[PDB]
């Protein structure tokens, strides 16, 4: 019955002939077990499973059903199968080894897409994603498929936010591949309108991207140019002034642009379009026909120190001979980059006026110079960051005035309180400025003292007046104190230990 079942099932029979003392045996288990041979052997074991289970099912329906406690699935099959069925199997293997017979089956390999099962289901998700976008983009730009796309949104968000270390040790090249294809289908999903939000899913997927350079094969090298053209379109329109092309894209631009450490991709759209996004920010120093910004400083801080994997601007901009045709970057502009930083350096020398009125939009413009161009080659050129830090201290001497902008200034203080070798001890000017901040805190203390003393015996609504004085005193004080307790007491205490004169004030 078994052999006739093979002959009915397997129509694979080969044509062999026409019509008619003590050899020392070596070991046979020296070579490893591949996926193909174990697939074939477990296929023979699975054929034994299916045949014996079909015969058992025939017995079950033959004897009027009846309880069968051996009816347990393949996983909880006891050791009797894996012992005795494999005994009979290997007996058959050594039987067919002699007198010339064998049967072969197989196709598999552990890889980055197909038959490595985690990547198998990741690729199934990517395939269903691309197929679903291909289905739905005409049906977006005019069902059950609406639900069918609603649920894997949350599935991909959960599995990618949960697993982040899947990417960096483990893959051959799908870390670029599947991620960039998912990003491709996200960006063609972008302007096409859906109800449920995905931008957090896109943000965590972008967080999965850094944790190589081969993605011309992927669309991602071209997707960067797509998003740059989108940014130029929308920044020009907003300079003059739409379905989804609004400020919602800037959060994904933030999380994708924020790649300070693992700027791995080479894409090389380096200087032109980022500078093309820079100049609206200076044009947006005034209103200039713009509904009010949302992330001016956050969109400005995306400038890393020429960190598309490593670039540097103004030579291939103004020298298109070998750059655009033939590159001219990462070693050429030893001083060509630093001409506009030197222009920026002069403004803090001028900002001595009190209020936020002279710096309206400078809260977004000043910080990214301090962050990025300082940060590179700090061991080589520390006087630049020193001048920048003391200039920011002088500019926050404007913030020493009691009330400038409680919304912008502490947000920017959190945006850039950083110091490496700039404090009271690196800079005794910073010590005198800390003494000035102590005098400012004494002004706040006298103010709160007068307000509290006036609060006695039902003078006025102290929650409206004395409290509001304390609020406006505390919040910029919270910004300054967060900078202080962040890193001003990072090097002060070692000097206060070594001598007395570090923090006498």
């Amino acid at each position: 019955e078994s052999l006739k079942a093979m002959i009915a099932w397997e129509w694979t029979i080969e044509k062999a002939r026409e019509g008619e003392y003590n050899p020392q045996p070596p070991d046979l288990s020296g070579v490893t077990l591949s996926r193909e041979l174990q697939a074939m052997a477990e296929q023979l074991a699975e054929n034994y499973h299916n045949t014996w289970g079909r015969k058992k099912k025939q017995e079950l329906e033959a004897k009027g059903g009846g309880t069968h406690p051996l009816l347990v699935p393949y996983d909880t099959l006891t050791a009797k199968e894996k012992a005795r069925d494999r005994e009979k199997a290997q007996e058959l293997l050594k039987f067919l080894q002699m007198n010339g017979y064998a049967v072969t089956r197989g196709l598999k390999d552990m890889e980055l897409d197909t038959s490595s099962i985690e990547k198998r289901f990741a690729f199934g998700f990517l395939q269903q994603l691309l197929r679903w976008m291909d289905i739905s983009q005409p049906f977006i730009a005019h069902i059950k498929f609406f639900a069918k796309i609603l649920l894997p949104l949350i599935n991909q968000y959960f599995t990618n936010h949960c697993l982040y270390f899947l990417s960096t040790p483990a893959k051959v090249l799908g870390s670029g591949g599947h991620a960039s294809n998912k990003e491709k289908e996200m960006i063609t999903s972008l302007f096409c309108k859906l109800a449920a939000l995905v931008r957090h899913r896109v943000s965590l997927f972008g967080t999965d991207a850094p944790a190589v350079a081969l993605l011309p094969v992927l669309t991602t090298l071209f997707q960067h140019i797509a998003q740059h053209q989108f940014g130029d379109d929308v920044i020009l329109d907003d300079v003059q002034v739409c379905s989804i092309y609004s400020l919602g894209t800037t959060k994904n631009t933030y999380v994708e642009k924020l790649r300070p450490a693992l700027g791995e991709c080479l894409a090389r759209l380096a200087a032109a379009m980022p500078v093309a996004f820079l100049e609206p920010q200076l044009n947006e120093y005034n209103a200039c026909s713009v509904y009010t910004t949302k992330s001016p400083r956050e969109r400005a801080i995306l400038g890393l120190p020429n960190s598309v994997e490593e670039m540097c601007p103004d030579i291939p901009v103004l020298d298109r001979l070998m750059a655009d045709i033939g590159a001219r970057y990462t070693e050429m502009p030893h001083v060509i980059e630093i001409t506009l930083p030197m222009l920026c350096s002069y403004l803090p020398r001028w900002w001595e006026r009190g209020p936020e009125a002279p710096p309206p939009a400078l809260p977004a413009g000043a910080p990214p110079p301090c962050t990025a161009v300082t940060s590179d080659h700090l061991n080589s050129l520390l006087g630049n960051i020193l001048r920048i830090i003391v200039n920011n201290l002088g500019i926050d001497e404007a913030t020493w005035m009691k009330r400038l902008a409680v919304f912008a200034q502490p947000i920017v203080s959190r945006a850039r309180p950083e110091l490496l070798h700039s404090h009271f001890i690196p800079t005794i000017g910073r010590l005198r400025k800390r003494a000035g901040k102590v005098v400012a805190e004494e002004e706040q203390l006298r103010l709160e003292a007068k307000a509290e003393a006036e609060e006695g015996e039902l003078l006025v609504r102290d929650e409206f007046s004395v409290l509001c004085r304390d609020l406006y005193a505390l919040y910029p004080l919270l910004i300054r104190y967060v900078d202080n307790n962040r890193a001003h007491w990072l090097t002060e205490p070692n000097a206060n230990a070594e001598e007395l004169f570090r923090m006498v004030g």
Partner: protein, 49 residues
């Protein structure tokens, strides 16, 4: 080397402060000397038959 940060103003004390000699500083062996059966052992238990 340091002791200028966290304890000198803060109660924490040098360990061998008021001594005239150091500690013995016991250490760990490598040779396997015999030792009697602890009766508390997980899975090695005897019986004086």
């Amino acid at each position: 080397r340091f002791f200028a940060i966290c304890g000198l103003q803060e109660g924490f004390e040098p360990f061998a402060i008021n001594m005239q000699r150091p500690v013995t500083t016991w250490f760990s062996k490598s040779l396997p000397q015999f030792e009697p059966v602890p009766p508390e052992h997980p899975h090695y238990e005897v019986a004086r038959m």
